[PDB]
Design a protein around this ligand. Structure first.
Ligand SMILES: CN[C@@H]1CCc2c(ccc(O)c2O)[C@H]1O
Lengths: 330, 50, 240, 282
């Protein structure tokens, strides 16, 4: 009975979104000069992983990074000197994500075991977080005391380290969520599921204010614009899209006729001009956010890339691939 | 169920025209473009890696 | 000063040695994935092989084998199936006696047909393009008791069985009726038809008939893994 | 004149082909980190030996053949002979080692990962290079190989002309260390590998009712045998009976053995990854 009302309200919201748009981003930004071709060289090549890497997270100082591999080792690296500060074995051989706390004291880790493991650097496991039906997919730290984990149970949850019990749970995703990204002020929060919909959550209220379903296939990556008023979602439809929270709709789509492979990880530059996206075609393509025209190609990886993180300083870009090699670019 | 209530809550949100948001993003990119080592190739002396 | 650099170099050396030993250990061990239907009977095979993720370590002929099984994640689309890309073989367990019964509450969508569709999805996967499948057909004696009874006819559920004939170059059991042999070989050929179409020398399907009290599953998996690695190495050198 | 320039053109083309193929192979393994494989270490060693051959002995041998005299010093002639023996022994023994590694990888798949590591490959390469260097330099530089008849004494005394004269014992030892024993090992391991491949093909045919190995082993064995075996059989013969084998046929078979090294990159680097690396480099 309520399905008709829901459809009518969805049509109304679509009409409102259409009426709220006058000129696309391309129309307003075609006047400014293009960024031009970009040359990026592998300054540091970090070797040591036994198996493929899935994710990594740069430290706050933009110097140290933590990388997770299916061998079960959560290796911490010093990008400047290419030295392994720590090597943390994992209880679960399969790992799907990792995190680096802003303070740098704690490092998170979770995989197919449905348990979020948190390690204390200054190395033994501090707290193991349980309560997720499906496999964990991404974890990030709001601060040294809280962490948000999104699992295959189609639910994103906010945990507390001291208590070990989730403070709140976010529901409303048809498919399992695959990625998330915290806001710069940590007030807001987004996650991209497999139902081609990316939802903006709220760590305080716990209700998704907005949902964007411009994609055609499952979403594999997501990341805020540095301003915090926009985010980019990378799906398997070979397209990267830049949504806008204030406009509640898509702005630009990044695609080419040559590429027919999905996107694994998406990250912005410090100023947000460059939208770096890691592809399934063994290379990473960098885009112009205001132009949608690809500038450079990072084809140094032998196998598929699985992660991509730009430093907080905006100095280097690190891409970890399936060939057990994590390369630093600049 | 609760889906209709959630979508009704989603619908009643104030929105701004896409022109304003696009202009704001463009202005942010233009204003903060100076402090971007990726856009402007940093000199080897300034580059910490090499 | 340089003392910090020296300490960091010492830590790097220790970590490098530890990961060298870990690499030796990891390359020594082989990985397997236990995939099957919920009521297929993987528990019986797991118990036989042993004697949110379940991992059992068993070794035969001084060769370490690792078996991974996940059952919490049950969805039409699986993202964890792309994670198992370095496994030597994917063990598939199918209930060969579940042809006449349906669990989806819909007509003609038999559990055997669902298992066949799952096998097709696993085989025709971009990431699983070099992973062989060791197929186990559990509960062969239940299938025998069903076929020797007139309760269910396969032709009513599987139309191709009406015109199907037993292979001349087959290997019937020492004590088995012609009817049960025809049924089991048709069920095996149903999977083998999907197996032959897609893969081209990259990976193969190994079908085995297993009862509820079979104890040779450990040796069968060992032989199948040996053949898989031999075929992979032979193709890498462009011989086979 | 016309005969000399044609032969000079042929030897120049052979030198160019050998050097180009070898530098391409070492560039392919060295430049790309995805080609760094345990077996690829042995392939790199083989390509390095072939490159040293084609850079050192083939050009000087061509100069000796065309000019009909040895302008350089007698000590340099001894060094050139030693380098040639080193290159030949290293190349053939590395081919044997690659065949052995394939045999272990196929016959014993479970133990192959543990049996061969980077350290084991490095120590095997060092051992083969040391044994080749021994067999080359130790008998030659210490003059163990020199003959006793007056023809050899006159040949070694004159600095202008520097031909090859070997003792029967040294010829037998050099042949049995360079070619014959590696030939036996390669034939045995490749027969076992062919038997295993036939067994696997029979198993596949039996399980799945609904030639390539023979061709690959045929090319691998036939190229090496046709390239080297005639030279080593005449190497044995002319020391067994001097009157049977002339110098021209001996030099011709030796140069066939030389040009063998050109085909090794075209045979042992036909993998799709190697083709992709070649396309990227070129
Ligand atoms: C100068 N020609 C040398 C003479 C003897 C000799 C060769 C190659 C391999 C051997 O084991 C040898 O004993 C020839 O290349």
């Amino acid at each position: 009975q309520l399905r008709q009302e829901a459809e009518q309200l969805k049509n109304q919201i679509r009409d409102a979104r259409k009426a709220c748009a006058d000129a696309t981003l391309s129309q307003i930004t075609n006047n400014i000069d293009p960024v031009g071709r970009i040359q990026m060289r592998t300054r540091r090549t970090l070797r040591g992983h036994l198996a493929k890497i899935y994710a990594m997270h740069w430290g706050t100082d933009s110097r140290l990074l933590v990388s997770a591999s299916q061998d079960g080792k959560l290796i911490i690296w010093d990008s400047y000197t290419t030295n392994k500060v720590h090597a943390i074995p994992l209880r679960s051989s399969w790992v799907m994500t990792c995190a680096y706390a802003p303070s740098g004291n704690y490092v998170a880790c979770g995989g197919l075991d449905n348990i979020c493991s948190i390690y204390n650097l200054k190395v033994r496991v501090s707290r193991e977080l349980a309560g997720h039906t499906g496999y964990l997919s991404c974890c990030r730290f709001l601060d040294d005391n809280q962490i948000v984990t999104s699992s295959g149970d189609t639910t994103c949850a906010l945990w507390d380290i001291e208590t070990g019990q989730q403070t709140t749970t976010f529901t409303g995703h048809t498919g399992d969520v695959m990625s998330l990204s915290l806001a710069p002020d940590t007030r807001l929060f987004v996650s991209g599921a497999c139902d081609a919909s990316a939802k903006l959550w709220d760590v305080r209220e716990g209700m998704c204010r907005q949902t964007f379903t411009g994609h055609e296939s499952d979403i594999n990556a997501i990341c805020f614009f540095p301003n915090g008023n926009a985010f980019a979602t990378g799906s398997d439809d070979a397209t990267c899209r830049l949504f806008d929270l204030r406009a509640d709709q898509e702005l630009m789509t990044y695609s080419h006729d040559n590429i027919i492979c999905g996107i694994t990880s998406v990250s912005f530059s410090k100023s947000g001009r460059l939208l770096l996206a890691g592809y399934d075609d063994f290379n990473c393509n960098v885009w112009d956010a205001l132009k949608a025209d690809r500038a450079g190609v990072l084809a140094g990886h032998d196998n598929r890339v699985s992660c991509l993180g730009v430093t907080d300083d905006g100095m280097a870009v690190a891409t970890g691939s399936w060939d057990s090699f994590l390369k630093i670019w600049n | 169920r609760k889906l209709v209530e959630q979508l009704k809550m989603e619908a009643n949100i104030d929105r701004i025209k896409v022109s304003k948001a696009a202009a704001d993003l463009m202005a942010y990119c233009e204003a903060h473009a100076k402090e971007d080592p990726l856009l402007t190739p940093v000199p080897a002396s300034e580059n910490p890696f090499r | 000063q340089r003392n910090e650099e020296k300490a960091q170099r010492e830590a790097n050396k220790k970590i490098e040695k530890q990961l060298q030993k870990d690499k030796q250990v990891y390359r020594a061990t082989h990985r397997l994935l236990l995939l099957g239907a919920g009521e297929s009977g993987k528990s019986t095979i797991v118990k036989q092989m042993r004697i949110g993720i379940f991992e059992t370590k068993f070794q035969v002929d001084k060769v370490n084998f690792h078996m991974f099984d996940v059952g919490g994640q049950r969805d039409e689309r699986r993202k964890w199936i792309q994670c198992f890309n370095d496994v030597t073989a994917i063990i598939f367990v199918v209930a060969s006696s579940s042809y006449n019964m349906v669990i989806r509450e819909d007509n003609q969508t038999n559990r055997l047909q669902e298992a066949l569709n799952l096998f097709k999805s696993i085989w025709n996967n971009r990431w699983l393009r070099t992973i062989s499948v060791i197929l186990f057909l559990n509960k062969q004696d239940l299938l025998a008791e069903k076929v020797l009874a007139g309760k269910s006819k396969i032709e009513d559920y599987f139309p191709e069985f009406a015109r199907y004939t037993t292979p001349e170059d087959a290997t019937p059991e020492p004590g088995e009726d012609p009817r049960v042999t025809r049924a089991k070989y048709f069920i095996r050929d149903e999977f083998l038809r999907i197996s032959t179409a897609s893969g081209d020398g990259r990976h193969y399907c190994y079908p085995h008939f297993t009862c509820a009290v079979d104890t040779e599953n450990i040796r069968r998996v060992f032989n199948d893994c040996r053949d898989i690695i031999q075929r992979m190495h032979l193709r890498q050198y462009e011989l086979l | 004149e016309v005969w000399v320039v044609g032969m000079g053109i042929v030897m120049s083309l052979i030198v160019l082909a050998i050097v180009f193929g070898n530098v391409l192979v070492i560039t392919a393994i060295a430049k790309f980190e995805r080609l760094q494989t345990v077996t690829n270490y042995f392939i790199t060693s083989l390509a390095c030996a072939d490159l040293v051959m084609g850079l050192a002995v083939v050009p000087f041998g061509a100069a000796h053949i065309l000019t009909k005299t040895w302008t350089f010093g007698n000590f340099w002639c001894e060094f050139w002979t030693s380098i040639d023996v080193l290159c030949v022994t290293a190349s053939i023994e590395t081919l044997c080692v690659i065949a052995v590694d394939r045999y272990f990888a196929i016959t014993s798949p479970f133990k192959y990962q543990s049996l061969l590591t980077k350290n084991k490959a490095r120590v095997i390469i060092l051992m083969v290079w040391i044994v080749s260097g021994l067999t080359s330099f130790l008998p030659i530089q210490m003059h163990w190989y020199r003959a006793t008849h007056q023809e050899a004494i006159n040949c070694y005394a004159e600095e202008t002309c520097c031909d090859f004269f070997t003792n029967q014992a040294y010829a037998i030892a050099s042949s049995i260390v360079s070619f014959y024993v590696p030939l036996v090992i390669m034939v045995f391991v490749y027969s076992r590998v062919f038997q295993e491949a036939k067994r696997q093909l029979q198993k596949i045919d039996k399980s799945e009712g609904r030639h390539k190995a023979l061709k690959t082993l045929g090319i691998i064995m036939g190229t090496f045998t046709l390239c080297w075996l005639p030279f080593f059989i005449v190497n044995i013969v002319h020391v067994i009976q001097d009157n049977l084998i002339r110098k021209e046929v001996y030099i011709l078979l030796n140069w066939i053995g030389y040009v063998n090294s050109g085909f090794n990159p075209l045979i042992y680097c036909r993998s799709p990854d190697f083709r992709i690396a070649f396309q990227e480099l070129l």
